Symmetry: D2
Subunit: 212 residues, 4 copies
């Protein structure tokens, strides 16, 4: 059940990346997962907004470089909406531990967006830890409850179809985005190291290479 998980954070919450990466590495690493911290590591790092996060999630998930994305922003809204526009990226909100469990069972998506500022106060790091505990333990997509899994599974499958239909082909779509945005998205050493090491889709690798 082990996955490659990419953590990616943007400028408004970058000061908190060390804390979140700490919890993710502790929890998900302890559970046997392979964790990559590909967004901002602090406020002085290669600058990103929640727009770049969505593009990064698409490139990493669609190229199969990673299996799951952890992201977020002050409220999680920008990052969640920025991820979900991309085909192949199915991102839920995650505000408290049972969100993560239900998301995995009902939606069986591949990204979650946390709120790192709103609702995040003294002792907020505990909730992040507990979210990771429930997100990355156990099996995924069994429905909840297990007996009612059929229509949930059916609709989750259809969601992927609709996303693929409404969207251009992945690379064509990326080419239509302002290329300044995409260049910025793939610009950091930590992003490139993850992507190039694990990309399973040559067309995406070649496209990314052409930007650098």
């Amino acid at each position: 059940n082990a996955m490659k998980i990419a953590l990616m954070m943007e400028n408004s919450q970058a000061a908190k990346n060390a804390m979140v990466a700490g919890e993710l590495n502790s929890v998900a690493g302890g559970l046997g997962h392979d964790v990559f911290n590909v967004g901002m590591t602090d406020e002085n790092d290669h600058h990103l907004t929640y727009i770049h996060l969505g593009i990064m999630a698409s490139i990493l998930l669609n190229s199969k470089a990673v299996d799951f994305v952890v992201t977020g922003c002050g409220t999680g809204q920008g990052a969640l909406m920025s991820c979900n526009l991309h085909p192949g990226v199915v991102c839920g909100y995650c505000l408290e531990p049972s969100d993560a469990f239900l998301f995995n069972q009902i939606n069986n998506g591949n990204a979650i967006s946390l709120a790192f500022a709103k609702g995040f106060g003294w002792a907020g790091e505990l909730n992040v830890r507990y979210i990771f505990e429930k997100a990355f333990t156990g099996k995924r997509g069994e429905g909840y409850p297990i007996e009612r899994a059929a229509p949930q599974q059916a609709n989750a499958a259809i969601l992927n179809n609709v996303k693929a239909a409404v969207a251009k082909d992945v690379v064509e779509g990326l080419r239509a985005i302002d290329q300044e945005l995409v260049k910025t998205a793939v610009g950091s050493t930590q992003f490139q190291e993850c992507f190039f090491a694990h990309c399973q889709v040559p067309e995406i690798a070649e496209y990314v290479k052409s930007l650098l």
Copy 2:
């Protein structure tokens, strides 16, 4: 500041539509908005899933038939992810009243997705009411706080561009969806009555007509 607002709910939460429509009509109607209840009205109504909800939100928002969509499902996740894939549909989560305020100020989107089952217990209707109070009172897109509105406004604008770039043209995209899904989405009398009365985009009207 008055808008046309469409409420749209799917089968799992359809029993609760009367309650939610009640609160929406009371709150938003009292504030001078024009409310349309275009999804399921009860469990026996024209059957919809959260997949159809997203298609309905796209058709109504992109045709300018309505200005804002209220939707949701058991956790809000399926409906939120189903809406956000569509160009022109910018849907936030909304779980408690300050979510609605912040969404309007920071993201300035045009749809919210509520959780009608998870976290919804005895006295849940109060929270729905209060959410509507904050969603539909006052101005939108001023940033929060007001002084920091610049980058938030800039990123919200870019989000729309990226959505438009990654997605096919609206009608082409709708044609690529399984047409059974789209026919179902536009199938009800309450949907058609809202759409045909208020659609401002002939190409969409003609496409919808061709399905009926």
Copy 3:
């Protein structure tokens, strides 16, 4: 329906008193209530802990100097448990707006304890505002729902009896507390100004005077 409301905060959250008093004065003042800020006003003010808060709530409520107490601490737990030990002080938690409404209708108590650190992040002041909006608007003790008010009202009445039975008489009890604690509790100018101006119970006034 107008009341005298005392806001009282302790050292760990004292930096936030200006914000909370601001919202309370704005909301409750606008609704015609008389607001007193009797706890710490900032970190440098006459020093209090959540222990002193409970004693202050007892003296002000039992002397009828005020009708309602707003208090809290990092999580609200210490202040809530410190208030509830005292006869005549019925303090609920209040974390989000519908808590305040339900508390007023079901429990019909006279104090609420907020969390000013845990769960309090960027945009936390909005939730405080909204809590005050629901706490101090409308009528109290009607049950919720209104039709089921009978057993709720009966039990709320009994709670007061049990508190009065288990506790010593008010003044005797205050005399049994470490008198250093009580002297500290009544020590500030803002506390004394409220108490002495509005106390309706001479025995309590005389006892308080004897400490000063």
Copy 4:
């Protein structure tokens, strides 16, 4: 670190006792604790309100029959306020898992009150489980963070003193309560079985015996 834990629920939430006892037995039992279900087991059981719950918590905690109480009601407010009036009973609210952890570290009390109706919807049992996981794993009273434990520990100690001072002696206080209430509180077979088997304070046992 093993404790004796009493679960006690009242009439409004009695239908949910099987679920809660299930989770408590699973979680706390698995962690080596000894669990007693001493309140209502279903809607037809020996009838209790949240008033009786507080009296039961006092008798069981003050007699040292148990180490910890799990209780609650629709919102948790009545049960929390009913417990906290009694000397020797230090009851926090518990609505989500990190509440339980912080309560144990900061307040180091001996009871928690959950909300079984408000905020409790589809998937609510997961949150109950997770709450028990955090309440009953690990050590208690270390402060949070650990480095800042001194004033938190000092104030928690003082809280006990103030409670003991304001309250009559335990048995005298129980005698002052309407004795119908106390007779009802100790009336069930499941309560008596726990109490008489584990009571370490003869005066309390003799008093309880005199009611039966």
